[PDB]
Write a protein that binds this ligand. Structure first.
Ligand SMILES: Nc1ncnc2c1ncn2[C@@H]1O[C@H](COP(=O)(O)O)[C@@H](O)[C@H]1O
Ligand SMILES: [Zn+2]
Lengths: 707, 167
């Protein structure tokens, strides 16, 4: 009677999350410790935990699934732990060192403010390509493509022969301004291919113009090396992960998450886009619901055990960071933009010895939770320990009770580490920390929306993650959101979002079109031609990716795009082309109008200064089974008595209060819960203090009010 | 506090990255000095008590017999009283010519001896290099460090001051 159709995974967070959903939108969320040395184990265990809540076995469910998506640390750890091939590098003679120099910035990427200024904490990771596997060719092309120093091909043959003699398992080629004029770089590419053929050895060649033709040599060269360093090894890892499921019943090809928020095959030609590990799925999930619910402006809030992540969906679209840094590497990958606010509910709480100020993080207990877990060994209190003291969390229901927690351990550790030093009671100390955390998150949401030129009233707030529903009341209080939403599957929303993502390949190329306000048609005719030619080069890449996955062009839905701005001023939006192709001066006028329209919709305009195109975009989408959103008829306002599961005292605003406990899954659409109550699940807790109310809709989404 | 082996790795320069980052970003351990000195003590070929390390191989030591405090090289050579400047009782080699300068720097990258001179202060017995000054000509020998050992031991560490005799 039950048909499990879609599977979503997110192993990048505190642990391995799995999200299963059936033909009706009924769901379960699985949780199990991650096993990065062999991620298959944790993926199986997590799936078995989730399906157990349905009374189902893994063996029975996998045979039903018709699609599944994975996101995690497979690619990330392969880069961080430097377990890739012996890839070589060919650059411009005289600049062989610019890769391993890391542009200086890679000595302090991912550092908290205090570590960034604390010089001695700075540290270089080993270069992806060592010096002895780097060579140079004599050539220079300037910023507009003029060949200042023509390519000296004899230096390319020698470079290629040098790396082949060093038994290079890959050869990357990156010359300056090849994104502008790829003539020389692609000539070096061909010369390398020839000398490889002669040698009889199997050595793939990667030209940065063919893979990531964008400005910034450091970003671009890193991103192309990943294709020759970690791509094929990552394919092996993802083969085992997908083989583990396949040899257990799955009849589909697994897809994986990409930086740009779309899913791609794990056999893709470009797999550097799978280095993403953060919960960008959560942003894709909220957008997917907004599309169906009618919410254009959404503030996403993922409060997990290891991170506090936030993001905005403004007018249906989400922001893409184009020159991000990941794994302490500057990269040329379009990434869904999220901001980290902290180190999760496992964030350690300390008193600075010199100041006695309260410090959260930046390190986190993570899966170890806190001191309340005696067998974890954690000796330092965490935000979760404050939830134990204050009574928000059920000691006997952490992961259904799998984790043996002792609330008295939290009371004792907070008393010696925080409360007594400050002269406070244990409850006031814990409540105070939670108060500090709520203000940080509340202000960071307010400021973020204010930055886009909006007020929270124009927005809706989504609160998910295992610990999101624990703080929703606190960091949404008084902001005046149109609606505050807690999904019933909050503990696996990031995994739900991976399954909601499109099967979407994306390719980018840099441009430098400069157009005054008024110009003759010929000039407009050449601008459209430049953009059109870029679209044509990217369309090839997109359709080739799908052709390898077994999909034909007439099955792919292409959406051309470009990044445009009023000259001199930058923007954080990308425009979908109203036209599949641009040729005439009128077609160009449509593209400039599309930006003016999008700019006014999201946000002040300045058509006077002209327009600049800095990049072209091509996206190709193929329809795939997506998680069904429940749409059940709503029942009575009063929750069933079977949902009441006792009372627990929790502490808020200097008051101990008897709170009604509820079994989340037992509640029904239409039910209303009046605080003080705690709606409990096996892997998430939804706190509703007095002065707050909640109701559940047909989609199993909770709505939070202040009454 | 940190494991003794971690502090040992620190001294030997073999510590791992994650621990070294901890030591830097986390609050200092008040127990570092006591452990640090003891680690250095068991590595000396003499049992004279270290009371303040001045360098990788230079220490202020309590002489086990006279109870005087002297600056001592790791090999055992005593320079002077702890209040005096050990350099004044050492051996020096001054690079005041382009010839000498180009033995440690490439030309053009080397300082100019008429502006800056390099002084190398050695231990007379083992020839260890304990300090290198780079002043202008004529410049006095620097007395780099005059520590307040009594206040350090007594007020900051809460430890008893070692027995001291006058020189
Ligand atoms: N019943 C629960 N069981 C386990 N963790 C919970 C529960 N309720 C809330 N959590 C919180 O959810 C966090 C994990 O969130 P996540 O990283 O999304 O899985 C934990 O650190 C807790 O603070
Ligand atoms: Zn000596």
């Amino acid at each position: 009677l039950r048909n499990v159709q879609v599977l979503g995974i997110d192993a990048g967070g505190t642990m391995t999350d799995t999200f299963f959903v059936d033909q009706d939108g009924d769901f379960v969320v699985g949780k199990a410790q991650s096993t990065p040395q062999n991620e298959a184990l944790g993926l199986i265990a997590s799936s078995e935990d989730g399906l157990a809540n349905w009374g189902m076995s893994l063996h029975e469910a996998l045979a039903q699934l018709q699609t599944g998506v994975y996101s995690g640390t497979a690619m990330l750890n392969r880069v961080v732990q430097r377990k890739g091939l012996k890839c070589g590098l060919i650059v411009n003679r005289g600049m062989e060192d610019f890769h391993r120099m890391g542009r200086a910035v890679q000595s302090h990427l991912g550092y908290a403010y205090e570590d960034r200024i604390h010089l001695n904490t700075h540290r270089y990771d080993p270069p992806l390509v060592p010096r002895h596997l780097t060579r140079g060719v004599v050539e220079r092309t300037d910023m507009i493509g003029t060949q200042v120093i023509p390519l000296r091909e004899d230096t390319a043959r020698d470079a290629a022969r040098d790396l082949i003699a060093a038994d290079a398992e890959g050869i990357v080629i990156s010359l300056l301004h090849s994104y502008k004029n790829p003539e020389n770089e692609r000539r070096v590419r061909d010369i390398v291919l020839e000398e490889v053929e002669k040698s009889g050895k199997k050595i793939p060649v990667f030209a940065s113009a063919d893979y990531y033709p964008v400005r910034k040599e450091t970003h671009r060269t890193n991103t192309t090396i990943l294709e020759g360093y970690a791509a094929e090894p990552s394919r092996q890892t993802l083969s085992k992960i997908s083989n583990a499921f396949k040899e257990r019943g799955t009849k589909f090809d697994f897809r994986v998450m990409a930086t740009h928020g779309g899913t791609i095959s794990w056999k893709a030609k470009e797999l550097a886009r799978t280095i993403v590990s953060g919960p960008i799925g959560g942003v894709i999930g909220a957008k997917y619901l907004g599309e169906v619910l009618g919410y254009k402006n959404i503030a996403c809030s993922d409060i997990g055990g290891t991170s506090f992540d936030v993001a905005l969906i403004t007018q249906g679209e989400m922001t893409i960071k184009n020159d991000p840094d990941m794994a302490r590497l500057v990269l040329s990958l379009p990434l869904v933009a999220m901001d980290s606010v902290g180190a999760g509910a496992g964030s350690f709480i300390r008193l600075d010895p010199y100041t006695r100020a309260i410090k959260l993080g930046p390190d986190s207990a993570g899966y170890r939770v806190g001191v309340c877990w005696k067998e974890s060994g954690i000796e330092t209190v965490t935000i979760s320990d404050c939830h134990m003291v204050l009574g928000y969390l059920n000691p006997d229901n952490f992961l259904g009770g799998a984790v043996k927690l002792d609330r008295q351990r939290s009371v004792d550790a907070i008393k010696a580490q925080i409360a007594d030093p400050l002269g406070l009671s244990v409850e006031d100390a814990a409540a105070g920390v939670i108060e500090l955390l709520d203000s940080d998150l509340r202000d960071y949401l307010r400021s973020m929306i204010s930055g886009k030129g909006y007020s929270p009233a124009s927005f809706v707030c989504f609160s998910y993650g295992g610990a999101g529903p624990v703080h929703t009341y606190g960091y949404t209080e008084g902001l005046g959101f149109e609606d505050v939403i807690v999904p019933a599957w909050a503990a696996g929303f990031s995994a739900f979002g991976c399954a909601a993502a499109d099967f979407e390949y994306r390719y980018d190329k840099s441009l430098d079109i400069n157009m005054p306000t008024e110009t003759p048609d010929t000039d407009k005719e050449k601008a459209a031609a430049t953009l059109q030619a870029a679209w044509e080069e990217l369309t090839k890449n997109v359709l080739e990716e799908f052709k390898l996955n077994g999909y034909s062009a007439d099955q792919v839905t292409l959406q051309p795009g470009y990044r445009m701005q009023y000259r001199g001023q930058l923007n954080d939006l990308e425009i979908e082309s109203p036209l599949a192709q641009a040729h005439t001066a009128a077609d160009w006028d449509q593209l400039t109008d599309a930006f003016n329209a999008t700019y006014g919709r999201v946000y002040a305009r300045s058509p006077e200064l002209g327009y600049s195109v800095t990049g072209a975009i091509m996206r190709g989408m193929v329809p795939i089974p997506k998680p069904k959103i429940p749409k059940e008829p709503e029942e009575g306002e009063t929750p069933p008595e079977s949902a009441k599961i006792g009372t627990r005292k929790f502490y808020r605003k200097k008051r101990w209060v008897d709170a009604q406990l509820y079994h989340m899954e037992s509640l029904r659409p239409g039910n209303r819960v009046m605080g003080p109550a705690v709606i409990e699940s096996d892997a998430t807790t939804f706190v509703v203090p007095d002065g707050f109310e909640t109701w559940l809709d047909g989609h199993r989404l909770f709505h939070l009010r202040e009454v | 506090a940190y494991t003794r082996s971690k502090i040992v790795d620190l001294v030997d320069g073999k510590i791992d990255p994650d621990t070294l980052h901890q030591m830097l970003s986390t609050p200092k351990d008040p127990e570092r000095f006591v452990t640090y000195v003891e680690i250095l003590q068991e590595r000396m070929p003499w049992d004279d008590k270290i009371i303040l390390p001045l360098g990788p191989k230079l220490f202020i030591v309590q002489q086990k017999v006279s109870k005087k405090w002297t600056v001592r090289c790791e090999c055992g050579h005593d320079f002077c009283d702890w209040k005096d400047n050990w350099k004044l009782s050492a051996r020096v080699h001054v690079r005041d010519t382009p010839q000498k300068m180009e033995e440690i720097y490439p030309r053009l990258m080397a300082p100019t001896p008429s502006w800056q001179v390099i002084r190398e202060y050695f231990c007379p017995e083992c020839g260890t290099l304990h300090d290198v000054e780079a002043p202008t000509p004529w410049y006095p020998v620097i007395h780099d460090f005059s520590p307040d050992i009594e206040g350090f031991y007594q007020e900051w560490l809460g430890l008893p001051v070692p027995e001291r005799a006058d020189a």
